[model samples]
Target: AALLRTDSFVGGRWLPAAATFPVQDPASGAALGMVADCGVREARAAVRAAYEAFCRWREVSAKERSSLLRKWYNLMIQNKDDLARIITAESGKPLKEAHGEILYSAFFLEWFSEEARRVYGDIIHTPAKDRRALVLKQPIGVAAVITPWNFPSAMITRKVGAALAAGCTVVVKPAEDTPFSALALAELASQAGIPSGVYNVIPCSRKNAKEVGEAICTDPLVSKISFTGSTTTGKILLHHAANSVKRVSMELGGLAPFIVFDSANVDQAVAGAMASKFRNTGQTCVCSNQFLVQRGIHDAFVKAFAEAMKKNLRVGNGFEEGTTQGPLINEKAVEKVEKQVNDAVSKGATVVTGGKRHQLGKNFFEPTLLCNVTQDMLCTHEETFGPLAPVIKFDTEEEAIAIANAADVGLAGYFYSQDPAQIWRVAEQLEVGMVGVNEGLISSVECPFGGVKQSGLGREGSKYGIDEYLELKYVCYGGL
Candidate 1:
C-alpha cells in the first residue's frame, strides 16, 4: 500500500489540517488513502497567499507565463502514465480512459500557453480631436476553483491552466470523492516551476467542505470563483457570492438528448450513442438522458445500440485491461441509478437489457437499456449519470426538437441524420450551447465549451477561457 497523504498545499508548503478523512477506492470499497479536512481557516490562508502572489504574478510578462506553462505541459506529457494510474486509482475510471483524460487535459495547458501571448487590447478613436480611448484587459485577482470528481484531473487543468495563463493566482478545492488526483497535480505543478503561492490545493473533507467553500466565496480578496458541479450547488454559490459581487463561471448539470432520424446510418448512430452514453461510466454532465429515435428506425437502432453496449462496455476495476466501464463513484450513485431505472419501469418504460446493479460489486451498475420510455418518467428530466440509456421514440422532426428542448438545462445535444437539409435544420434548432451533427465527442481545447439557460454561465477552453479570469477597463485620456 502507498502512504496515505493528509496535508493541504498552501503557499507552496504542505500544511497539516485540524483533522483528516479517508479516501475510498470505489471499485473495491477499500480505503485508498486519507486527505486533509480543510476548513475556513485553511481557506482564508489560501486566499491571502493567492492575493499576495497575484500582485507579482500579474506583473510577469505574458511571454514569461507562456514559457512556464509550456514547460508544465512537457512535464505532463513525460509523466503521463503516472498521472493516469493515479486518476484511475482515485476516480475508478478505466486506465485507458484515464490516459485519454491526461492527454485531453494537457491540451488546455498547451493551448492556453500560446493564447497567453495573444491577449490583445483595442484602441478606439474619439470624436474630439485631442481625445484617445483605450481598452485594457487585466487579471482579476485571486480565483477560487471548485471541481467535481467525474473528470478529476481534466477539470482542474481546464480551469486552473486558463487562470494561470491569464495571470491570475488560484486556490483549488477538489471534489470530496476525489482529492488525491488534485493534490497529485499540485506536486507536478510545483515541479513544472510554478511560483510559490501561485497555485494552491485544499483537499477538503465533506465535514467542512461547505465552510471552506463559503469562506472562498465570501472573501473580499478573491475576485473570481469558477466551478464545475451540480446546478443546485451552483445556484447556492451564486446566491452567496452576490455580497462580494465576485465574477463567476460554472459548468453545471446537463440532460442531453441524442436524436436519430429514420434516414440516419444505423451503425454509425449506435456507435455514437454508445460512446456518448458509456464514457465515464455515463457520469458525465452531458450524458444523454433521453434517446430520441424516429419510430421507423427505433427498433433497429435500439437492438444495435444494446448489442454494441454489451460488447464494448466491459465493467470492472479501472486497472483491468479489458474493462472500459468501472463502478459508479460510490454506493450512493449506485442507489440513484437503481431508483431511476425503477421509476422509469413503473412509468411505462421497458428494459431492453440491463436494468439492475452488477453482481460484481456494490457500486457497479449494469449498463442499462430501456425502451417505450414516456415523457412523464423521471428519467426523461433527470440526469442518470450512470451507465444507462433510455430510448424514447419520436415520430416527427418537430416532435424530436420539442423533446430535445423540453428540458430547461441545455449543455449539449446530439443528432444523427443523412439528410444535409435535416442536419442543418436540426442543428440550428437544437436548444443547446453545443451540438454534434454526426459526432458524439465535440469537446476540444481549441473550441469553447459551455451551456446557456439553467445549465450555468460562461465558457471554458479555447481563447474564450482566459477571458473568464480577466477584468476589462476602459481608459479615456484628454489632450493625448
Candidate 2:
C-alpha cells in the first residue's frame, strides 16, 4: 500500500495539512482514507516551488529531460497494477477500465519523452543583406495543472507530460474526490529521479477548492494554467488568469452527439454506441450525450442496443470480478441522471430498459435506455453525466446534422456511415474538435485531443500538446 499516499506532495516531499478529509468508496460508501485538505496557503507554496524549480529545470538539456521522462514511464509500467488499484479505490471505475487508463496515462509520458528532443526552431529569411532572424521555442515557466475526478491519472499525465517535455515545471491540483492517484504518481516521479520542486500535487476538499484554485490561477509566478473540468469552473479560472495575462489551455464540458445514419450497419452501430456511451458509466466529458438515429433504422438499432446493454453491462463494485459498470462518483451524480430520466419519461419517452436505480444501493444507477426521445427533453439538451442513453429519432441527414450542431459546446462527435461520400461529408460538417467516423474509442496518446467553441481553449496529447507549455521568441542578428 505504498502507493496509497494521503499527504500533499510539494517540493518533492510529502507534507500533511492541519486538517484532513475522508475519501469514500462510491460503490460501498466505505471509508477509504483521509487526505490532506490543503488550502490557499499550500496552493501558493506549491506555485512558488514550481517557479523556483522551473528556473533550473529550464536549464536542463532536452535529452536529459527525455531520459528522466522515459524512466518515469518505465516505473509506471512496472507498477501498473498498483496504480490501477488506486484509481479504482478512489474513482469507482471498473478494474479493467482502471488498468486501461493506467496504460493510456503512462503512454503520454512515453510519447512526450521522445517529443522533448524534437522542439525544433525556425530560421527566417532576412529582408536586408546584413540581417538574420530565427524563432526559438522556450519553456513558458511554471504551470498550474488542474485535473478532474474521472480518469484522474490520465488527465494529470496528459498535461504534465507535455509541460515537462517542454522544460516547464508543474503544480497539480487534483480533484477532491480522487487524490490518491495523483499522489501515487508523485511517489513514482521521485523514484524516477525527477528533481525536487519540479512536480507538485495539492489535494483539497470541496469547500476549499475554489480558494485554492483561485490562488493557483492568480499567482504571479505561474505563467500557464491547464485545466480539465466543467465549463463553469473553466470560465472562473479564465477570469482569474486574465488579471495576470497568463497563458491557458482548457478542456471543458462536452455534449457529444452520436449519430447513426441510415447507411450505417445496425450491428456495428450498436457496438459503437455501447462503447462510446457506457464507458466510465457515461461520466466522461467525451461520452455521447445525444443519440441521433435515422428513422429508417431507428427501431432496429434501439432493439439491438437494448439487448446488448442487458447482456454486456454488469453493475457492481469496482474490485469485484465480472463487474463492467461501477457506481457513480457520488449521490449527486446519481440524482442528476435520475432527474434527466424522469424528465424524459414525463415528456413521452418510452423506457426500453432500466428506468430506476439499481438494487445494489448507494451511488448505483441502472444502465438506462430510452426510446422515442425528443429535442425538448432535458436529457437531450443537457449532459446527463451518467449511464443513460436516450435515442432521438431523426428523418434526414440534414436534420441529424442540425440537431448535433445545436449545442453550444462541441468536444467530440461520432457517426456510423458506410457510404463513402456521406462519410466525408459528415466528417467535415461536425463542429467538434475530435471526430470518430466508425470507431467508438478515438482517443490515443498519439492524437490531438481537445474541443472547439465553448468546449475548450487548447489541445492536449499528440505533437501539438507541447505548444501549450512553450513560448515563441524571435531573435534577430543584425550586421551579419
Candidate 3:
C-alpha cells in the first residue's frame, strides 16, 4: 500500500492537509497517494484566501496577467510527460491519451491567455438621451470551481484557467477519486508566481467533497460556481449555489447520440464510431451512449462495431506502451457497468461484442456494446462511464433526430451525413449543446463547451468561458 498524498494550496503554498484519504490505482489494485480529506474549515480557508486576493488581482493589467498565463502554458507543455504520468496513474487513461489530456489542458492556458485581453465591456451606441448608456464586464468576486475526476487536469484547467484569466480569484475542489493532478496544477500555478491566495486546490471524497463543496457554493464571498459532473450532482450544486444567488457554469451528464444515416459512409462511420465511442473506455460524459443508425445501415454498423471491439484492444496500466484504453475507474464503476450489461442480456438484448468482464484485475471491465436496445434500457439513460454502447435502428433522419433528442439529457448529439443539406439540417435541429457531424470528437480550447436541458446552463470557452467568472455592471457617463 502506498501512503496517500494529501495536499492543499493555501496562501500560495502546497501544504499537507490535516486529514487525508487513501488514493488507489484502479488498474493494479495498488495504493497511490494520500488525498486531502477536506472539510468546511479548509473550504472556508480557500474561499477566504480568494476573497482576500481578489481586490488586488482584479486590478492587475491584462498584459502582465496574461503573460503569467502564457508562462504557465509553456511550463505545462515542457513537462507534459510528468503531468501525463500522474494523470494516467490516477485517471486510468492510456498513457498516450493521458498525455493528450495534459496537452489539451495546457491549450486553455494558451487560448484563454489570449482571451484575457479580450474581456471587453460593450460601448453602447444609445440614441441621444439625457446621458449616454453603457455596460461593463467586471470580475465577479471569489469563484469556487468543482472539477470532476474522469478528465481531472483538463476539466480543472479549463475552468480555473478561464476564471484566473478573467481576473477572478478561484478556489477549486477536485474530486477525491483523482485529486493529486489538480493539486499538481496548483503547484505549477504557484511556480509561475500566481499571487498568493489567488488560486487554491482542495481534495476530498464525496462526503468531505460535498461538505466543503457546499460551503464554497453557499459562501457569500463566492460569486460563482463552475462544475463538471453528473447532472444530479450539478443540480445539487446549483441549488446550493442558489443560496448566494451565485452564477453557475455546469457541464453535466449526456446521453450523446451517434447517428448513422442512410446516405453515410458505412465503413468511415463505423470506424469513426468505434474510435470516438470507445475511446476512454466509453467513459466520456459526451460519449455516444445511444447509437442510432438508419435501418439500411444498421446491420453493417453493428457488425463493424463488434468486430472492431473484439480485436484484443491493448489494455493494461496506462503507463505501459501500446495501451489504448485502461480499466474502469473503480469497483463501483465496474459493478454498475456489469449490472447494466447483465440486465441488458437478461432482457434479451444482443451482445454485439464485449459482453463480459475481463480478468485484468478486480477493477478492470471489458469494453462492451449492445444491439436491439431501447430508450427504457438502463444504459440508454444512465451514464455508464464505462464502455457500454447500445445500438438502435431508425428509418429516417426525422426519426433519427427525434430519437436523438428523445432523452432529457441534451449535452451532445452526433450524426454522419456526407450530403451538405443533411449535415447542416440535422445539426441545426438536433437538441444539444453541440452536434458532432462525421466526427467522433468535438472539443477544442477555442470552442464553447456546455449543454442544455438536464445538461445544465452556461458555457465554457471562447468569451463565454469568462462568463462563468464575470459580472455585468452598467456604467453611464457624460451628460448629453
Candidate 4:
C-alpha cells in the first residue's frame, strides 16, 4: 500500500511538506500512508486565498458557475475509482460501500450545480409607483468547512460543493483520520478545473482544529463557517463565530433511532438495519444506532438479524477479496465503542448475539448487539458510533416515540409501521428533522438532510443547503 502522505493544495498547487500523520489500515494495523499535517499558518494562507478568489468568483455569472461545477462533477465521475480506493484503504469498508459514497458525494456537484441558478431574486410589492424593493440571494463570502472522517469524501463534498456553487470559495479542514481521501478530492477538483485559491485542503490535528475554526470564524472575509462533526466541536465553533457573527451552519452528530414495531415486517427491519447501520460499519452520525423494538416481534427480529449477519458478513481487509465489512476508524474508536458495550453490561444489559471484538488484525470492532437497555444506559443516549447496536423494547408505538425522543438529539428517525396512520403520526411527533417510514433512505443530494435540537442547525442538500452560504440583499429603486 502506498503510505498516506500529507500534501497541501494552496493557491491551486500541491504544497509538499514534511509535517505528516501516520495513516494506517485499521483492519490490520499496517501502515497505509502518512496523511498531510497542515497547521494554523497554512490554514490562514488558504483562507486568504479563498477570500481573494471569492471577490472575483462571486461576481462571475451565475450560469457560468453552474457550468464550471458541472465540469468538476463529470471529472469526479470519471475518476471515482481512484477516490473510492483511497476511502476504503484508511477507512476500511467494502469496495462497493466506498464506491457508493463516491456516487453520493457527486450528488452535491450535480444538485448544487442546478441550485446555483435557482437562487432567485424577487421584486417586492410597493405602494409608491416609482419605488421597488428587490430581494436577491448573493454570495455570503469565503467559507471554511470542517467535515468528519466517516464518510470523508461525501461529507466534504456536501459542504464544499454547495459553498462553491453559491460562488463562495472554500478552505476545508477535513478530519485528520481521513485526510488523505480529502486531499485526493482537492487534487481532483484542480483537475476538474476548479481554479486554484478557489479551493484548498488543510489537514489539521486535534490541537489545531480550534485554530482552523478560529481562523474561519474571526476572519471577516470568511463570512460563513459550515461544519459536519461532533456537537461539542460545533458548539465551540458556534461560540467563536458569534464574536464576528459569521453565518454558520452545522451538520453535526445524531443519535438516530430505528423503530421496529410489533406490527412491522420482521425481514424488512433487519434489511433496513443492515443497510443503515452496517453500511459504513455504523460509523456515520445518522446511522441507526438506537433500535426501539416492540416486545411482540423482538425475538423474531433478533433471530433473523443474527442469521443475516452470519450469512452476509465477509469481514476482511477493505482492499482484499471477499470483503463485506471493514474496521472502525482507529484504535481509539474501537476502545470507545467497546467501553459503551462494557458499561451497558455492567448496568444489567444483555448481549443478544454479537458483542466480542474481532481482533481483525487492525482497529476492528465486531458488529455487536445489546438488549434490555434502559434510558439511563450510556448506549441509550451517548452515540455508540461503531457497529454496536443497542435495542430497547417498547410495548407500543407511543412508548417507542417517547423513548426515541428522550435523547436531546433530534436528527433523524425511522419507523417500521405498516399502517399509514401510525407512520404519519410517529413521523410528525418523533421530534426529529427527518423521518423514514418502512424505508432506511434518509439522505439525498436533492432531498434536504439535517437534524433538529442538539443534533444540528439548518437543513442541508436541495436548495436549502445553499441558503446557509448566501446572504439576502435588498435592492431599492426609486428614480431609475
Highest lDDT scorer? 2
Whole-model Cα lDDT of every candidate shown, in order = 0.84, 0.89, 0.79, 0.78
Candidate 1 yields a Cα-based lDDT of: 0.84
**Root-mean-square deviation per candidate:** 1.8, 1.4, 2.4, 2.2
- Candidate maximizing TM-score: 2
- What is the RMSD, in Å, between candidate 2 and the native fold over all Cα? 1.4
Which is better, 1 or 4, measured by lDDT?
1
Q: Write the per-residue lDDT of candidate 3 for residues 1-480, one digit (tens) a residue.
A: 111236787878667667888888878868886676878988898888899999999999888789989888887887788888888888888887787788789998888889889888787866667677678888887888888888878888888789988898988888888887887777678677789988888788777876787899998889988888877788889999877688888888667888999888887887778777666422234343568888898888888878887773665777787776688888888888888888877887888776677767677777778888765675444676777787877788888887777657678777888899989999999988877788776677778777878786788766678777877898878666
- The all-Cα superposition gives candidate 3 an RMSD in Å to the true structure of 2.4
Cα error, residue 84 of model 4, in Å, equals 0.6
The regions of model 4 sitting more than 4 angstroms off are: 1-5, 280-288, 359-361, 379-381
Global CA lDDT computed for model 4: 0.78
Give candidate 2's error at residue 171 in angstroms.
0.5
Better of 1 and 3 by TM-score: 1
Candidate 2's residue-wise lDDT over 345-405, tens digit each?
9889999998789999888989999998887785343545788888999999998888898
- By lDDT, rank the candidates, best first: 2, 1, 3, 4
Please list the residue runs of candidate 3 whose C-alpha ends up more than 4 Å from where it truly belongs after superposition. 1-5, 280-288, 379-381
Model 2 clashing residue pairs (backbone) = none
Comparison by lDDT, 1 against 2, better one: 2
Look at candidate 1 and tell me the lDDT of residue 406: 72
